[PDB]
């Protein structure tokens, strides 16, 4: 019953009679399972902030590190995770990859209360939170199997889009629930509900430069989503950031949707190019907002500039993905025309190739959510400035926009 042996999505008759209904149902359970995995992935971006408030004495370098490490394991587990769905099947893997997330969620619910818990423990739990970051790879591969090649866009769009919204959901919930264990426990009932719901409701089917472009855009969304709260507390220790810090990732997520549509409207490489300009320009204006020696800083501006870095990292993600998508469509066109084949064959293989390549592009891309906050770690621990790290980002976004020129346009 759970196993499907005759799967013909490219066949309209099949889709009408049963495919659409089955694929639709798998999507609807896939989505909550994915956003939840994002919630768990970015935990410390609301937990490392509250660690001293409960009596833990850790360096800011030790609080940024815990916020950075999930993206190391996440990145390393994305390649394997993409091979898991063909091996174990969508339903078995969704249930497992969603279920095992209770381990790290419960653990740090305890460890945060016992004020004598070593740093070595918190390293492990954060690294186990990185497992949830790999779920994206498997979830996305799974969906690509359920949908025909020319429906695939929207469904993949819905899956990753609403999944990414998981960061923003946690940022909003973890403070509200804290009235600590609460931030890390309120998802155990939801993880379980949806491990069960997958198990009984889902089905088992029987260019390095583009890594750099995705790294610069998505790795930045996740990188900022991790370290922003922690940064807006060493720069403005007076303001309680966890009633604003969700709005960043939320706005960034919505910017993905716009990114792709805008990109096909006036050029994937153009919107990418113009966006890195806005990504360096906005990296610069953040110097003027800081509380520096003698000079009084401004929060409103600092916050609004980050709210513009989240927007610009969001657009860039949906802009680089349409770039990749378009590059692969062109390559598959040329090979098939040379083989003397079908426009249909080309369309299918362009979809296959963009999906097979994703488990590797999003692995390289996820390395950014380690660097950005570990940059704020090493900068604010060598000096007393975020400037040292923030200077490297500015240099990087320039290095990227020259690279988009050098190869495209």
């Amino acid at each position, epitope marked *: 019953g759970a196993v*499907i*042996t*005759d799967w013909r999505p490219e066949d309209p*008759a099949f889709w*009408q*009679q*049963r495919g659409q*209904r089955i694929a639709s149902r798998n999507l609807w359970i896939s989505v909550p399972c994915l956003l939840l995995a994002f919630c768990v992935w970015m935990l410390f971006s609301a937990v490392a902030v509250n660690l001293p408030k409960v009596g833990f004495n850790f360096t800011t370098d030790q609080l940024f590190m815990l916020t950075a490490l999930p993206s190391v394991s996440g990145a390393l587990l994305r390649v394997p995770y993409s091979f898991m769905v063909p091996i174990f099947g969508g339903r078995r893997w969704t249930a497992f990859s969603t279920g095992i997330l209770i381990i790290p969620c419960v653990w740090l619910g305890f460890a945060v209360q016992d004020t004598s818990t070593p740093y070595s423990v918190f390293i492990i739990i954060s690294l186990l939170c990185g497992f949830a970051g790999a779920n994206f790879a498997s979830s996305m591969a799974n969906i690509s199997f359920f949908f025909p090649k020319q429906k695939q866009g929207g469904a993949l769009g819905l899956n990753g889009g609403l999944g990414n919204m998981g960061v923003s959901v946690m940022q909003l919930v973890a403070p509200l629930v804290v009235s600590l264990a609460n931030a890390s426990w309120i998802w155990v009932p939801f993880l379980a509900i949806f491990t069960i719901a997958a198990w009984f409701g889902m089905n088992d089917l*029987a260019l390095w430069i583009m890594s750099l472009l995705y790294l610069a855009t998505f790795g930045s969304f996740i990188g900022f989503s991790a370290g922003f709260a922690m940064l807006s507390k060493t720069q403005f220790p007076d303001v309680q950031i966890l009633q604003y810090a969700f709005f960043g990732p939320f706005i960034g997520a919505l910017a993905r949707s716009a990114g792709g549509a805008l990109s096909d409207r006036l050029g994937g490489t153009r919107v990418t190019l113009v966006n890195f300009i806005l990504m360096a320009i906005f990296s610069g204006l953040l110097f003027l907002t800081l509380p520096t020696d003698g000079q009084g800083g401004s929060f409103m501006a600092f916050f609004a500039v980050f709210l513009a870095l989240f927007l610009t990292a969001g657009l860039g993600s949906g802009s680089t993905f349409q770039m990749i998508s378009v590059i692969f469509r062109k390559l598959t066109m040329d090979r098939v025309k040379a083989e003397g084949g079908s426009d249909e064959r080309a369309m299918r293989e362009a979809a296959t190739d963009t999906a097979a390549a994703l488990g590797f592009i999003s692995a390289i891309g996820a390395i950014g959510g380690f660097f950005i906050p570990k940059a704020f770690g090493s900068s604010l621990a060598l000096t007393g400035s975020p400037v040292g790290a923030m200077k490297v980002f500015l240099i990087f976004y320039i290095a990227c926009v020259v690279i988009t020129w050098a190869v495209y346009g």
Partner: antibody
Amino acid sequence: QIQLVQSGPGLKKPGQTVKISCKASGYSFTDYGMNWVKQAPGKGLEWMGWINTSNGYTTYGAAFKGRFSFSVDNSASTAYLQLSNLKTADTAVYFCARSWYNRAMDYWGQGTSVTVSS
Amino acid sequence: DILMTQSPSSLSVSVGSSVTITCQASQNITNYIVWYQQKPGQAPKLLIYYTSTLESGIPSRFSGSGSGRDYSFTISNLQPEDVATYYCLQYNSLLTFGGGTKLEIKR
């Protein structure tokens, strides 16, 4: 309690039309396709085609294009086979059967025997 | 159209004996094969789908295997109730029945 129950035996002269029905019950009718199978006396099962129960679209095997019609009444949750200009060779038992794709023909009707004779 | 040759067309086998029916497709049917049991005057009954997956309630004495163009079906501990005509069917491109195998039991 999944069941397909078909109408009863009919006798007809050559030149006439017959319409056999098949009531499905115990399952959501529009989720599964309906196949029709012919068995002439002392012959093997012969697949006639199916009808998509979302489309209402028919698909006919080569030998059954012309005088054959699959139709559908979704609200009655039943399927029909219409045979026009009956020939003697149409004498057979006719089965409806659920499913084109996963578990093909996993539930059968009891069959409906048609005799073409003067 | 994809053709299906079924062998044998009839056989007589002892109680507790093993039957083997083979089916050859005219081209690759990519594991989409089903097997039916047709006791006379009754409605056919699906035993196996997708080469080897037994329908629920169907006794373990039944089995199937194959790939590409070649498939077989087996009844191992033959009981008197197993008397019937058996059919393979291809449901790859359209559907095609095998010609049948009328199984007589011996006593």
